[model samples]
Target: PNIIWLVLEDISLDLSVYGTPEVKTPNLDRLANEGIRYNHAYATAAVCSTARSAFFTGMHATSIGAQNHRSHLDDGYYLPKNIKMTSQFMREAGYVNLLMGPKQKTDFNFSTTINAFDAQDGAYTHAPTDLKLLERPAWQTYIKKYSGQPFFAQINYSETHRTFIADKKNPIDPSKVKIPSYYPDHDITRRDWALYLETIQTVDQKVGNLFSELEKAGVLENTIVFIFGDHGRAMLRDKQWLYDGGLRVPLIVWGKGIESNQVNNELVSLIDVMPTTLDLVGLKVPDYVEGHIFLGKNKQKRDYIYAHKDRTDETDDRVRAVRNLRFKYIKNFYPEKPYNDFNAYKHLQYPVLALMESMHAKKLLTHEQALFFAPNRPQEELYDTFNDPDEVNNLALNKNYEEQLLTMRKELQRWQKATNDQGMIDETPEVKEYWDDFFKKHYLTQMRLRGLSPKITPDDYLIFWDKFLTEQGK
Candidate 1:
């Protein structure tokens, strides 16, 4: 069976099809309506490079020293030949492998560009032009070349990513966009959210076009499509954190032979992507692969999902979480480390981070409202996601969840040890130097992408942070 994987970055299960009707995503909604939609889908990690590595390699990022976002001083360690990626496996089985809009965004430790599918990427034009599936030059050409053979292609869409651009065609209303309970009731929160929803609408239109072109090409029946985000939304306590906000994502599997309009609540991880694809094509999943098959015959489902967080930019922390349908347990190895750290990349993207910082300094923020700025965090955190859907209430101290907590904790520790979570070791001086330099490179990259707001440089963040903080003072 041919596999056409579509991946978006930085989004959660907020689509209208996922019971969140605030946004109109007809393109995504149609896919869900035609296939099996997973309500409990999650990424193995919060960040892109970390989470995507699992999808590409079927191995935990940390297990291979690819846990950090991008890399820890260029720790893009090589993957063992035993653990072949989906594209590689498919190609070896006489299938053509291709990478579309979402080619290697950043070279990572997973080495998809090296070992995995000898992916032939595409050509594109300007904004809103190349993103469409049919309009771009290589989209159809690649398909035509691979039409004689079974193929696997990964198509990436950047609309759901940060710096949400407004769509005048499908203009959004901030009042209509649902503000997550975890977010502060501020204008930027709503304003930015509305902008994100607007982008989704625009992207959904592109998705619809993709299907239309697939039908026009008369090969819709021959292809299997899977669509999901790398991780959740890029917001406070979301992208970098391992709460449901960070891990949960919208997942839809449609196309030839897929169950129609079915919703599965089974626990599924990004790691399962590779295994499931291999299963569909009747190929043996590599022994080194950590994920289970969720589709086709001999399918298996997980009872719990695990996600990890480590070394985000200049910040260094280790957090591992295990969540069943009811409860979530998070183990924080770095309890003494303060949540406030110099993450220049975040400072440039999340406008609310600086506001929270300034509010923390002036004592104007309440203890509950200042969760992210806390000086220290508990070694372990437990949340009853059923009761506290927002995950605002911490149940770790509560005696009621002791047994539930212990079970998940034991499972997490066992999983970590078995997976060789070697990245858990203390950072050496050499590693520290690399991390610091990596943080600077990220900040500089953001500066180049954003180009700064005039008179902006390495030292300009404090001024920008101070500028946002001034809002709280008045």
Candidate 2:
């Protein structure tokens, strides 16, 4: 049996199938109706690079020391030296492996054996432009080149990214968007969310087109199609943070030899993709892979799904989370850093977040909104997701749940120790410097465009920040 995986970038559960009435994702919904949908799926990490690495290697991010987003791992990182990927494993078993779209840095090790198309030329190959070409005759070309052979083809689609322009015609209605209670009902927040829905609709159209092509090729019934988002939506409190909005992604598997119209409530992570695919093709998953096969006939119930968030552009520190069916527990190593700082695209994509910051600066918002903008995180947080999906209430300090919290904390620590997470003790002035440079290069550019001061040094800014927070009694 041939396998074709369509990995989408920067998407969320913003589609109609996920109960978002405003957006129409008929193709994806159709796929879900025809296959098994894992409703409680999550990624090992929130960022693109780390999650993809975990998916390909079937290892948790902490185990490989590659948990940080966009950070180049040194030679000592735990990425396997010549171990077979699912593609390579299938290829060795007499199958053709093909890949297309944005090649991840972690993919370099297997690039030699896998056939790559439209390889990166280090130019301004932005989205929409690249997506248009990728959705074209690319699949047909591959099938023509390698017909009469079992193949494993991988395609990464990026239309759901923030860089793409969302058509207003397909805009998601604000009334239909279920805003988490933690966020206030402000116009800017609503508008930003509506725009995100529009992007989802546009991407859904692309998905429909791709499915149509597969049907026309007469391979729809024979090939296995695995469709999922790379990470969560690229927005404040979603992209780089360890929150549910960041790590939780939609996963659906359709086509040959799979159950249909069923929702699996078991906890699953992106790392499970490799083992699941290998299991589908009747291959033995290696013991080195830290993930489990989530789709087999007799799958075990998953009690917990683990996730991590490390330093990203202009942000350095560490956070880990353990989410079960009813509760979510988060541990922050750097409690001094503000929650807003972990939000990488707050200023760039959600201009309202910056406006809220300015309102806090000028003392305009209500006291509640001011508190929302304040930086400083708790060392630990426990949320009863069933009771409060928004996660506004922290149950860590509640006495009634103390025992459960302690048990979960111990489980978290045990997992970390077993995984050998370097994030526990890895802190250096060099890492700080790298984070500082990142902010200057990325955030400063946005600040300058918004007419904010561009000459403030990190030290001076931090000093004034201390005074403001103190005055606000934060």
Candidate 3:
């Protein structure tokens, strides 16, 4: 059977079918109604490059030194020779692997020689990097070219990422969006949130169009579609943090012989896509793949999902988290770093953040909303996500939850040791210098654009990278 992964970028479990009614995602709702929807699906990492690397390899990004956002591209940190992408494994199993969508974005952080998709046989070559979707005839012609052969294709939808475009066809009302308590309830925040929902509506239409073309090509019946976001939504705390808002994603699988309108509450990670797809196609999963087959006869149950965070752009941090059915424990390796640290991309793109910054400085934000501007964080945080979905109340210091806290703390350490987490290691001197130079130049550019002085204090620069630099050498 042909397998198609419709990968949406920077989204959370906020679809209409997921009880979010602010936006209409009819196509996604249709997929959920016709297939299985997982309520507890999560991404291994909260950012694009790291999460994509984890999914592509069927391994934890930390284990492969791919934990840092947008790192390892030119650093000679290639995956182990034995570790080829999951798509490469599918290709060896006689499946034609294709990377589809406008940009054909393969944003894996690690450098690799293995081409995951068949460049000569996919729609990417026809109109590479074009903003418009491939027309129906283009899709039909491509399907016919590889007729009778099973294919594994990954399609990227970038509308949900930052700089979300307004969905003129189905615009969402800013007043209708439910603002989270952590954010200030203002029009700027509401409009930004509404625009993201609007973009999702646009993506929903594109999804319907793709399915229509696939059915017209006569391959829909034989094809299985897996729809999911790469990670959480691109909101302030959601995109780069380890909170549930960052980890949770929408997962829907639809195809022949699958149960319809089923809601599975089992914990599943995006990395599981690799082994699960292989198992569904009757191919043997490689032993090196850390992900479990969450479907088919050899399916496995997971008790917890682990996630990591490292360097993201100019901002540097290291955090680890573990979540089970009800409880979530987060360990902050760099508690000194403030939650509202400077990130050029977020400062420029996320308007909500700027508003929060202004309100926080004026002492106008409520306590819950002002927590984000804290100068330092606790070394550990524990939250009962089921009871406190916002994760505002920390249970780590609460005596009643001490036992759960210890158990979770131990579990994170065990997983780290078992996976040989490469994130525990500091960045090499050369790579550190490379990032410092790049960010310094970009920082000045952004500062000038914002009509600020083109200057950053040496102390501030050291503070940004103090976690690793102090451990390396003064």
Candidate 4:
């Protein structure tokens, strides 16, 4: 069976098909209509690189030390050499692998032998300036080239990524957009969201075209089409944060003997995609792969999904989160830093850090809100997502949720111990120096460029950092 994975970059469950009527995503809806839609599917991490890494490796981001976005794989904090990625494993099993559209070879670890086309070469112009070019018949040259082969093709659509731009003539209506509540209701936020929706509409049309090409090639019936977003929507409280908005993504699998159009509510992770695909193709999942198969009758139902965030740059803290059906528990090792740190991408939207500084200068903010503007963080955070989807209501101090919190903490420890995920617990001076040096070279440079200063006291950084090291374990 031929497997085709269509990855939409940085989209949320914003389509009308996902019950958000504000946005129109006919193609995605049609795909969901024909496939098994997983309502509770989650990415291993909120960030793109980490989530993609987890998907490929069949392991949680933390398990492979890929908790941060775009970190160096050659660093000691990368996936173990023993763990073979999906493309590598599939090629070993005699499958012809091909990747097209908006992705670098390093993203999937695909070698020259497997990748037949390089869509990243900018051979195709996506957004044509002239309407004549737009009306020109869509290109199917690449599809025709790969038509005869039984292959696994991965296509990533880049429309849904940031710096949202769309044809003004075909602008998505701002009134129809359902903006998430976490963001302040303002013209800038609404306009940005509408622009993103416009991109999504364009992406949907492209997907429809792709589906039409597949049908024309007579491979639609044989190809197993798996469609999902790489991460969450590019908005506040989404993207870089560890909230559900960032981690929860819409996943639908259709075509080629996919059994039914049922909505699977079981907690599923992006890591499971590879194993499930292997299973669908009648290939035995390797014992070494950490993710479970989702399609089969004997597929294990996961009770919990884990997520984490690691300090990148000047900030150094550990945070681990566990989510079940009813509760989302987060254990932050650093509580002093603002939940959302100063970053370039975020600055583009809200100018949040700058605004906070302005507010501080005017002496208009309270201490708690002021503390959030600091560079570091405190010790712990717990939330009942069932009651507080926004995660504004911290339940750590609430005695009513203590038992649930304790159970989650135990499970977190057990999972870490079982997976040998003790990388953060290292206290050796050399290891600390190694991490600090890595942070300075990579993350800190970016932070500095974004106007964040290192003048924030080291004592405050340590106070919050040490609180996690000392109090979180208990």
Candidate 4 local lDDT, 193-281, one digit each (tens): 77677777777777887777668667787888889987787765577666788888889999867766778888888889999888877
RMSD of each: 4.3, 6.3, 7.2, 8.7
The TM-score measured for candidate 4 stands at 0.78
Per-residue CA lDDT of model 2 for 205-301, tens digit only, reads: 7777667666766777788988888778776667676678888888889987777888888888888888888888888887777788887783546
For each candidate in turn, the TM-score is 0.89, 0.85, 0.90, 0.78
**CA error at residue 172 for candidate 4, angstroms:** 3.0
Kindly list the per-residue Cα lDDT of model 3 for residues 1-474, writing each as its tens digit: 889888988889889999996799988999999999999998998988889999988888998888888787876778888777877778877887777776467788787887777642230111212233445333444566776678787888776886566666676778888777888888667777887787788788878887876776677888889999999999898889989889999999999888798999999988899889889888888787888889767998998998999988767789999999899899999899898887777765666766777677678888888878899999999999888998888889999999999999999999999999988898767776677778788877766754655444433332332332223222
Q: Kindly provide the TM-score of model 3 when superposed on the true structure, using C-alpha atoms.
A: 0.90
Q: What CA RMSD would candidate 4 show?
A: 8.7
Candidate 1: residue pairs that collide: 76-109
Cα displacement (angstroms), candidate 2, residue 234, comes to 1.7
lDDT of each: 0.75, 0.68, 0.80, 0.65
Compared with the true structure, the alpha-carbon lDDT of candidate 1 equals 0.75
lDDT, candidate 3, equals 0.80
Off by over 4 Å in 3: 120-147, 444-474
Candidates by lDDT, descending order:
3, 1, 2, 4
